[PDB]
Amino acid sequence: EFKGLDSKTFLSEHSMDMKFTYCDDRITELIGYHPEELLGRSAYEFYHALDSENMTKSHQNLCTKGQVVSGQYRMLAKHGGYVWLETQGTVIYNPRNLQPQCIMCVNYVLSEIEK
Amino acid sequence: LNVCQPTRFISRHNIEGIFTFVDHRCVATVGYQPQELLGKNIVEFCHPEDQQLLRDSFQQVVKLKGQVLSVMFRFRSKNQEWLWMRTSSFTFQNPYSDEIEYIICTNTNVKNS
């Protein structure tokens, strides 16, 4: 039941449109997905209906400011239901031209799977 | 539109610079398996002329308290060639905790002179 901090965080990388380019394996024991199945799919696929619009807004703030902390939101779990999550997002830039390369996300889970 | 994807991998480090997690994209980027980097200090793979700059980056990233630092240095690939690497890094601590912060890096092979 109780899990240690390391086991409650998973790192993800996204292209600037929010499509997964990488996800660490810690996601599997927290909400069921294997990273391979997430690659190339939009973050939005996994946002709960009630948070999707708020995520759009956080994404806008992330791209202007370069970093954001999300609100509490729900990520849809692989077999139904959702976990509550918070994410710290960071845009990675090319310093030579200030162009955005990708988004780094540090995702940490705030609940067990709920229905 | 398809675009040429930069070659990059993510790693995590303690503040001293020891690799404590390495994404498997490291094989395509620098030619090492993750377990060849885990437990070693990233400065061991850094060109001698760039080692002070890289050690200085670790201290600077800690001082930034979560903000991103970008450093460009030469990394010795598995095939013993110096590759230009832009590392963008920042510290993180789960906000519900006071555990020692670690450093998250995104490491991209880029062009440079």
Ligand SMILES: O=[N+]([O-])c1cc(C(F)(F)F)ccc1NCc1ccco1
């Ligand atoms: O990919 N993003 O740009 C992203 C942004 C944010 C944001 F809210 F902007 F902080 C949170 C999670 C993510 N991605 C991770 C995620 C996708 C689906 C569920 O967690």
